Design a protein around this ligand. Structure first.
Ligand SMILES: CC(C)CCC[C@@H](C)[C@H]1CC[C@H]2[C@@H]3CC=C4C[C@@H](O)CC[C@]4(C)[C@H]3CC[C@]12C
Ligand SMILES: CC(C)CCC[C@@H](C)[C@H]1CC[C@H]2[C@@H]3CC=C4C[C@@H](O)CC[C@]4(C)[C@H]3CC[C@]12C
Ligand SMILES: CC(C)CCC[C@@H](C)[C@H]1CC[C@H]2[C@@H]3CC=C4C[C@@H](O)CC[C@]4(C)[C@H]3CC[C@]12C
Ligand SMILES: CC(C)CCC[C@@H](C)[C@H]1CC[C@H]2[C@@H]3CC=C4C[C@@H](O)CC[C@]4(C)[C@H]3CC[C@]12C
Ligand SMILES: Nc1nc(NCCc2ccc(O)cc2)nc2nc(-c3ccco3)nn12
Ligand code: NA
Length: 390
């Protein structure tokens, strides 16, 4: 009924509004990573590659998505590039998110070998090998998995296109078995479940390790209570062998390697008294541990539970990015499955189709907002840039 120019004028104005915020937002992220030296870690090299794929949305993907909506006349091998360039961009964001999840898992499971396993020179190479495979995954329709060989000649004659030209529409050049099996299932859904399995192993490793330092502290504070309330030298010997193993395993620096060394010294000095026969002398040597327990060991566990809880806060922030990438791209993929798995169902309405395309494009703006709300370093560099560069 209504002229298609009225409906499409709403779409282009909304598309150009997303392109403005996708270039303005992610350019502040890339600018802060090179303006600040605290943001130049390996984890943020994948953040830049994520923002570089969200800048390309406002430069190429959104302008391409407008042209394909008009259904203009184009060669069926050129119409594929306008249609499938987004699939390369979505494939790079998935590979970057997957690299951030394993980067945070290597740092939480192996904190003493991170600086040797995960280096910047190796990260720049992993990024280059992901972009190549992103073009191989997103542009593999052009390799021969097309509907170009089966043209809709009813729409090509009405449009009045040339020889070898097809009315350039998305669902008329790339088949749906590619969008559901290869694109959604094998290349989007499986890596999404892997990030959910990697992140669950991050909060599980931290939750087990947060309980270990408190179990050790509980062991060192109550076995000490057994010493001053003991009636035998062997009862003091038993409590010390546990306090020596628990402390040495609490050890697994700045006053760290010194105060813990005072603990093992006083313990082993009280072990020779209990094994010799002097009970009252060993119970007095164990009270010397209380001072070190309130000066060095209390300040080690205080910082260990502080650095381990911030890795819980930081991993939760990056996990929301995986949750917002799915909430913005699954609605478009679910409509695809209805079109392919239920031929008896009617197609989704066009207002819902372009609602799923616009929503999937709004994913290029949410990421710089998560950094400014849940990362203090990014929130301060941004404020430093906006106030100074004005
Ligand atoms: C910043 C740079 C890389 C952007 C330039 C790439 C763009 C503008 C180029 C590269 C490939 C080109 C497309 C490939 C083939 C065709 C088929 C033709 O019948 C209509 C134009 C169309 C659809 C071209 C439009 C312009 C195009 C999309
Ligand atoms: C959190 C996110 C994933 C929620 C996604 C909700 C969307 C993608 C779901 C919820 C209800 C679904 C719709 C329910 C029924 C129909 C009618 C059918 O003839 C076409 C598909 C269509 C229109 C479905 C498309 C997908 C749909 C719109
Ligand atoms: C959080 C992630 C895993 C959600 C994944 C949802 C996908 C894999 C599932 C959830 C609901 C499912 C759809 C629900 C109903 C129908 C209608 C039926 O006639 C054909 C299959 C179809 C279209 C299903 C296809 C697969 C489907 C879209
Ligand atoms: C982990 C794996 C095994 C489960 C997830 C795969 C699911 C979501 C996919 C894989 C194969 C798909 C099915 C393949 C074909 C059909 C027949 C069609 O008439 C109804 C939809 C239906 C039934 C699809 C529904 C969704 C489906 C079951
Ligand atoms: N199904 C689909 N359609 C479109 N646009 C075509 C909109 C349309 C759909 C039907 C119709 O008759 C006329 C126009 N863009 C699309 N992008 C995607 C997509 C991108 C990433 C994953 O799925 N799926 N998708
Ligand atoms: Na992206």
């Amino acid at each position: 009924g209504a002229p298609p120019i009225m409906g499409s004028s709403v779409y282009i104005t909304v598309e150009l509004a997303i392109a403005v915020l996708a270039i303005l937002g992610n350019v502040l992220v890339c600018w802060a990573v090179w303006l600040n030296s605290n943001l130049q870690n390996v984890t943020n090299y994948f953040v830049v590659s994520l923002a570089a794929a969200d800048i390309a949305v406002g430069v190429l993907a959104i302008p391409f998505a407008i042209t394909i909506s008009t259904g203009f006349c184009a060669a069926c091998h050129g119409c594929l590039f306008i249609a499938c360039f987004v699939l390369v961009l979505t494939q790079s964001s998935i590979f970057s998110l997957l690299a951030i999840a394993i980067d945070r898992y290597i740092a939480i499971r192996i904190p003493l070998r991170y600086n040797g396993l995960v280096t910047g020179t190796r990260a720049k190479g992993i990024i280059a090998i992901c972009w190549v495979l992103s073009f191989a995954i997103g542009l593999t329709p052009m390799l021969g998995w097309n509907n170009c060989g089966q043209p809709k000649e009813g729409k090509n004659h009405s449009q009045g296109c040339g020889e070898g030209q097809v009315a350039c529409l998305f669902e008329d050049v790339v088949p749906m078995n590619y969008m559901v099996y290869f694109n959604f299932f094998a290349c989007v859904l499986v890596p999404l479940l892997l990030m959910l399995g990697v992140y669950l192993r991050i909060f599980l490793a931290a939750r087990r390790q947060l309980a270990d330092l408190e179990d050790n502290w509980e062991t060192l504070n109550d076995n000490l209570k057994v010493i001053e309330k003991a009636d035998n030298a062997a009862q003091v010997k038993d409590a010390l062998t546990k306090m020596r193993a628990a402390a040495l395993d609490a050890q697994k620096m700045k006053d760290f390697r010194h105060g813990f060394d005072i603990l093992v010294g006083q313990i082993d000095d009280a072990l020779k008294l209990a094994n010799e026969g002097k009970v009252k002398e060993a119970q007095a040597a164990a009270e010397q541990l209380k001072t070190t327990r309130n000066a060095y060991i209390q300040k080690y566990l205080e910082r260990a539970r502080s650095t381990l809880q911030k890795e819980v806060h930081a991993a939760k922030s990056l996990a929301i990015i995986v949750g917002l990438f799915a909430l913005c791209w699954l609605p478009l993929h679910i409509i695809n499955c209805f079109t392919f798995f239920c031929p008896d169902c009617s197609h989704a309405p066009l207002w819902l189709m372009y609602l799923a395309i616009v929503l999937s494009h709004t994913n290029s703006v949410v990421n710089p907002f998560i950094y400014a709300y849940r990362i203090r370093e990014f929130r301060q560099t941004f404020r430093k840039i906006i106030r100074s560069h004005v």
